[PDB]
Design a protein around this ligand. Structure first.
Ligand SMILES: CC1(C)CC(=O)c2c(nc3nn(-c4ccccc4)c(O)c3c2-c2cccs2)C1
Ligand SMILES: CC1(C)CC(=O)c2c(nc3nn(-c4ccccc4)c(O)c3c2-c2cccs2)C1
Ligand SMILES: Cc1ccc2c(c1)-c1c(cnn1CC(=O)Nc1ccc3c(c1)OCCO3)CO2
Ligand SMILES: [Mg+2]
Ligand SMILES: [Mg+2]
Lengths: 337, 335, 339
């Protein structure tokens, strides 16, 4: 939806330098922007490049202003302003509008005001959908689950029974919330299923990527705190607890009964052992092999990275034989001493 | 609800306390309230059984002196817990009866008491055995066969010509029978090899959510009886998994791997193909399996986490370990 | 489906030795093949085994021919001929045929000729489906997305809005194309979503496995080149660009803004970090941990493989303490150097 530059500047708390009557139609990258677009500059190395940008307006700082070759919106934080203006001008559609005649909705489900449910979605008995909730096409929402006001599911999301989802969450397609945890007892080599009768509780303002799986708890619950952001294809096992505002990047695999504190950052493709705790304010870099508890805040890493194959063959063989190398070092130390 | 004495009989457990107590459900020790049965495995909880508010606790004989409530005495509290949770299970079924919005080919062959959820799609020639339950939004492709008692949660995809045994359970988002990753090369251009084998899943197999099991190229991908597979796993074409093996979350297996019986594959392991793992092998988490495993036991890989400042030095030195080796050999020659 | 052996041989450009009137019904492995089946031999150790194979015909080389115990098709490349004959005799069904009454299709969607849309599929406003496109049961195709002629989606594929897919592509079930990239700003310790208003552009002849995710770009686009093959459970982040003919095996994760060249081969379970480039003709072996750009073609690897647990415990402890081993070696060198 188009907006006058002066009105956009007011909504952004930006200082306008230039024509307030310019009409802005959307956001674009600096290299792709054309007339009607607003863009932003975060890297001052691009000052000398601004004459190449065809945007109608550029968000920048006060120090950048002398280098502008366009209307400019001056702010302290161009990146955050970009995020805000991209929300004002967002072109992303809603997953559904109104209630599709092909949706299958149990007579006992409770729908708030202004709820939309897409084609062929399936809502079980006892479900409660808060005001402004949007359920995409093809979703399934299981018995007695509750989805708080303003939350949105994209197409083909699966929510099992007895799940609680807070307000203003966003779940991408293919995600499964509330499948059975991996709970089995062993009887003489045969696995005996343990029914998983806990739940999943997801807080407010949680964003979950695509094809992520969050299993329900065995007895007590799997819990995702407020403001958590989880990328695609993560596995959050039964009885995991993830503290408020933690970020989990793509493809992280967590085992059961892991507790992660608040304010953590878990890098993509990490692997985290279960039945243990990671304290608040921990960053694990990508592909981290988290075998043991983390008890102090800070940054932690693992992994021996890529080498040319010919070199790697020697590295791996020598590491595998490092005990012999250690024994030889000690023997030579003794001989020299 | 069930009387404690009746529950104790079904569990073959020895009752110490009031058999007339009514048990309504299972709970953890910390959450248990009047009416709940709970269990303990670790002796550390003995000291505060007096804070547990369950109506009964499953425990061992050595635990009995510490009991502060009715107690069921058994040899294996964890297994008894599994059985009592089955007796008291509150989990609903994926569907009941056949939904009017399900789309079912007239040539599907349906047993007795089959339930099919809303908007599920059943192709021609599919056979569903007695008591099979197909969740909402599933797809079951042409000529696939699902044995008696098996159940699919919502939004499961089964391709064509797949065979699934009796009493299996498949969680949502899983895909069984997609094409294996098979391509010839005609001068830099990939040429698709149609994948015309199948997947054969035995009896009592449980598969997690968003797991993929690909069909074979000519012969079949095979999942043995009693296998349990967690979420986010990839089982490539022509993999064979032996009975009772367990595969934890996020494991990736390459084509034509054969895994034996009673194996335990830890989470996020990577198992290469065209090789065999014998029976009774455990691979720990993130294991990098490059070679056949011919003896039972526990196997591991990986250099675990360190503080970043320490890791930087560890990785740099490991990357230069050939130079360290050459320097050591030079020093030996000199000495 | 069935075809006379002489006709199959002509279509494969193979030399027939045997009865061209044999009727071939399908392809099978050597171990499983029965009357009516054609099979192939690539490994000459099986020459002595050919009398146990009950196929009606076997594809083989001229050097294998004296060992035959069946009608034979002689070719230079049995494996490639196998791929071609399996295509000729393919038993794989189509994801759908015709337009299902239970599909929900916006009035503004545009269909080419001979499109098939499966049961309970959902097609949004503005979608364009090319000639011969097949959309499987239960799929979702979001607003304004375009799928080129001959492309096929299996059941339960999700395509978001503003996605472009070329011709003759194949996408397996459970895959999600165009979900939001993992983009957030920081407002005084609160995450602020960055709308992901770029797209995904997929070229021609791309095959994508099952439960793979390919996120849309933040402003500009995620791009998959022509002829790319991507296995199951892969994660392609926002703004990744993959060059023509690259192959990505199962379970690979690629972080945002990675650029991969043409003719690359990325082994299963690799982890490729972002904001960097991999040049053409690079092979990364399985489980590779890619932290830096790759500027020269060739083969690259990482990872310390499995050992018995008791051995691994000692290996890991010694590696974690390798700085002390390095210091000890340096001290010993100074002593041997008389310093
Ligand atoms: C949340 C944010 C706005 C900032 C952030 O913290 C983050 C972001 N995207 C990431 N992608 N990958 C990734 C993905 C796949 C493979 C390898 C790496 C990370 O590790 C990512 C991280 C993190 C780095 C270290 C801890 S979390 C976006
Ligand atoms: C594309 C092709 C026809 C040939 C090919 O190169 C390839 C293929 N299938 C693979 N499966 N896995 C795999 C899968 C899961 C776990 C571990 C390994 C690889 O790594 C594979 C590779 C590659 C090897 C090195 C770089 S790509 C089939
Ligand atoms: C996730 C993680 C991360 C880092 C790790 C470990 C685990 C780990 C290491 C050594 N032991 N463990 C625990 C482990 O792998 N247990 C295990 C093994 C096989 C199984 C299983 C559990 O669940 C049932 C299926 O088979 C090395 O670092
Ligand atoms: Mg319908
Ligand atoms: Mg992985």
């Amino acid at each position: 939806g188009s907006i006058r530059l002066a009105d956009l500047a007011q909504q952004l708390d930006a200082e306008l330098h230039g024509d307030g009557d310019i009409v802005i139609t959307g956001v674009a990258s600096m290299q792709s922007a054309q007339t009607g677009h607003i863009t932003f500059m975060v890297n001052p190395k691009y000052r000398e490049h601004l004459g190449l940008c065809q945007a109608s307006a550029v968000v920048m700082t006060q120090d950048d202003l002398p280098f502008a070759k366009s209307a400019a919106l001056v702010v302290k934080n161009p990146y955050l302003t970009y995020a805000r203006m991209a929300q004002i001008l967002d072109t992303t559609p809603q997953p559904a509008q109104n209630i599709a005649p092909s949706a299958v909705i149990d007579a006992t489900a409770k729908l708030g005001n202004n709820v939309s449910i897409g084609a062929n979605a399936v809502i079980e008995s006892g479900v409660e959908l808060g005001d402004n909730v949007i359920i995409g096409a093809g979703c399934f929402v299981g018995k007695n689950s509750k989805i708080g006001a303003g939350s949105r599911l994209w197409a083909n999301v699966t929510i099992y029974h007895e799940i609680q989802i807070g307000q203003n969450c966003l779940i991408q397609s293919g995600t499964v919330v509330g499948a059975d945890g991996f709970g089995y007892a062993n009887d003489r080599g045969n696995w005996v299923k343990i029914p998983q009768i806990g739940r999943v509780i997801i807080g407010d303002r949680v964003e979950i990527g695509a094809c992520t799986t969050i299993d329900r708890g065995a007895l007590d619950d799997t819990i995702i705190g407020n403001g958590v952001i989880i990328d695609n294809q993560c596995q959050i096992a039964h009885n995991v607890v993830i503290g408020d505002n933690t970020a989990v990047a793509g493809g992280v695999i967590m085992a059961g009964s892991l507790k992660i504190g608040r304010y953590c950052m878990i890098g993509g493709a990490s692997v985290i052992n279960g039945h243990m705790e990671i304290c608040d304010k921990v960053t694990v870099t990508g592909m981290g092999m988290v075998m043991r508890p983390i008890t102090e805040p800070g940054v932690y890493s693992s992994g021996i990275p890529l080498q040319p194959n010919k070199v790697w063959r020697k590295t791996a063989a020598l590491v595998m034989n490092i005990d012999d190398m250690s024994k030889r070092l000690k023997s030579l130390e003794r001989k020299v001493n």
